[PDB]
From a paper:
Homoserine dehydrogenase (HSD) catalyzes NAD(P)H-dependent production of homoserine from L-aspartate-4-semialdehyde and functions in the aspartate pathway, catalyzing the synthesis of cysteine, threonine and methionine from aspartate in plants, fungi, yeast, bacteria and archaea. When overexpressed as an immature enzyme in the mesophilic bacterium Escherichia coli, recombinant homoserine dehydrogenase from the hyperthermophilic archaeon Sulfurisphaera tokodaii (StHSD) was markedly activated by heat treatment. Thus, specific conformational changes within the catalytic region appear to be responsible for heat-induced activation.
From a structural analysis of the purified enzyme, binding of NADP+ and 1,4-butanediol (BU) to the enzyme was detected, even though NADP+ was not added during the crystallization. BU was found at the binding site for homoserine. This structure was designated the IM/NADP/BU structure. This indicates that the opening to the substrate-binding pocket in the immature enzyme is not sufficient for substrate-binding, efficient catalytic turnover or release of NADP+. The side chains of Arg38 and Arg39 form hydrogen bonds with the phosphate group at the 2′- position of the ribose moiety of NADP+, but not NAD+, within the ligand-bound structures. This tight binding of NADP+ can restrain turnover, resulting in the inactivation of the NADP+-bound immature enzyme. Disordered parts in the IM/NADP/BU structure are found in the flexible part or a part adjacent to the flexible part.
Author numbering:
A (entry chain B): 1 to 162, 171 to 223, 233 to 304
B (entry chain A): 1 to 227, 232 to 304
Write the structure that this text describes.
Amino acid sequence: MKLLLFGYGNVGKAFRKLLHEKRSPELNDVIIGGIVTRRGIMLQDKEDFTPDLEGDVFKAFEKIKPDIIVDVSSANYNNGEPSLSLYKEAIKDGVNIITTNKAPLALAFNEIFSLARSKGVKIGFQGTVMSGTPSINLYRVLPGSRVIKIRGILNGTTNFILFEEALKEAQRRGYAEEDPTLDINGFDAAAKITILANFMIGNSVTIKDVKFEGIIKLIAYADEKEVWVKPLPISQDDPLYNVDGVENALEITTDIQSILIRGPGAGPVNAAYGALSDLILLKRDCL
Amino acid sequence: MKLLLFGYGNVGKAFRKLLHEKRSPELNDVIIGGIVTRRGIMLQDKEDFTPDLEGDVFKAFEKIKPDIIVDVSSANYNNGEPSLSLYKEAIKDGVNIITTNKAPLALAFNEIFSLARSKGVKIGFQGTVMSGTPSINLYRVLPGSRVIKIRGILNGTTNFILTLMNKGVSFEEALKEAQRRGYAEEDPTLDINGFDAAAKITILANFMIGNSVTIKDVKFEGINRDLKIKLIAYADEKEVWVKPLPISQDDPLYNVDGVENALEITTDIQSILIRGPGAGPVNAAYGALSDLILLKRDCL
Ligand SMILES: NC(=O)c1ccc[n+]([C@@H]2O[C@H](COP(=O)([O-])OP(=O)(O)OC[C@H]3O[C@@H](n4cnc5c(N)ncnc54)[C@H](OP(=O)(O)O)[C@@H]3O)[C@@H](O)[C@H]2O)c1
Ligand SMILES: NC(=O)c1ccc[n+]([C@@H]2O[C@H](COP(=O)([O-])OP(=O)(O)OC[C@H]3O[C@@H](n4cnc5c(N)ncnc54)[C@H](OP(=O)(O)O)[C@@H]3O)[C@@H](O)[C@H]2O)c1
């Protein structure tokens, strides 16, 4: 099976490295047919990017005919393109999608997932929320339960900050978005809670419906009625108390119980492992 | 598909109820063919147990010919029986197993899982560790990652007793409350003396680290009134233990209080912690139900 790798920054390079470490027997048949950046299309799996052709992700898609697209490109919160149009075309063609790019999902979740479900196409999106720490995929192992509310710390960069020296270290460590105002001004946290509300609660929201601010903890919240992101004081008994540094946490409340998962919120290798986890699950037919 | 339900105490009853809530489309073809207690065999799905036949779990297996056994019976750490021999017969007959009963897996994990792998039979065992809080099933969504070490509070009953004693309640009243809530093992010495926690860390070491250990390999102690102290379980590639330890304020496990449990899993990629209710009949039954749905999805 052939992957098209869309993006080759820190996450894309880390993903290619993880694939080549041969971490699961069911990835033995998986090859990268092509890699696309802003600089063009490489129709080969190489450690170093050198373009073979000029052209965008649609040209690469037509040239390669991939079985799966792995989207690790920059978030475009303006309109989610070209990923939004690309996912739609891939789903129509029966091409599975694995993504760490929040933007098309933060803007158009219902449109994308409705189309996928109607076509029997699978979407892996673990890396969009808390990188490699099961979040999306945690919910996959909570079947037959109704999610009532969601609460968490969903942005790694800003939690690591909690100024100029802090950010600089975070950018050095690769935690930050290419546009780091997306981290600071809360877009990233709001995108993640949007994705979580859609998937787990079923509350069809876009990032436009979320009330949010920026950088006590930056708390993202969703229930059946509302979705928001705001700073709040935290109790000592509250399980979010000492989720500090790059750490992120997701508290899922159901009809049965409340559970919390905590882990590294950001980090290119962690994000890439999220996408890799989705790939293994796809291969097992468990997405 | 037909289930044989082995046991009908708090967990079994809660499981039956959850199945009847029809919580997933995967479960539409799933029926209980029989329920076994130490009072005999009920060849019917009913809220209250009344035996139709006298006989043990083996006789029930023969009479029902189930597609799946759900083991919610009492732990037997002396020898894991009759569950251990039952699992071996089931696997050989192509019968899948879902269990919340730790004993056979704490004694003979490699034997059971080797036999199962060879026959292509699936084993759900989420409920053996932290009830309905993904633990076993959390590791299922961490594929292609090597587990280096694990540390946690793995017994709800003793955590609940430690917390209440910190709140100035006697050990004796804290235990009675744990029992009233249905947190405790039928034999509460299994919780108190650390057997239950040791069983769980054994299972995790086997499943996640891949070392073929048994409960006899674990150095463990439990709790008493004489001792924040937390009953800490730990495993890595070289050692497995359970002991009550003083816990500092900055430790992620400091505020894991009451019946809450928590597991920190360190992989080659990352360190993660999951926390939630350690015990509770409905929580345990939900663990088993989660395994059932995953089994139907072919994702065990
Ligand atoms: N950083 C983290 O820790 C983390 C954790 C979870 C999720 N994520 C998500 O993962 C994604 C990638 O993160 P990253 O840190 O790897 O960013 P990055 O290092 O800037 O990589 C972005 C890659 O996408 C390519 N790209 C961007 N826009 C494109 C376009 N219009 N056409 C073709 N290629 C394009 C870039 O090409 P050039 O090489 O030519 O610039 C670059 O190779 C982001 O969406 C982010 O939100 C990141
Ligand atoms: N307590 C929790 O919240 C929790 C959480 C996770 C896992 N678990 C595990 O789940 C299991 C069941 O828990 P529970 O609270 O439901 O215990 P329980 O209330 O004591 O129920 C045990 C059931 O098994 C039956 N049984 C025991 N030995 C048997 C034998 N040799 N043959 C036939 N039937 C037998 C009992 O029959 P009678 O009714 O006739 O006595 C009873 O119906 C235990 O292994 C426990 O470790 C419990």
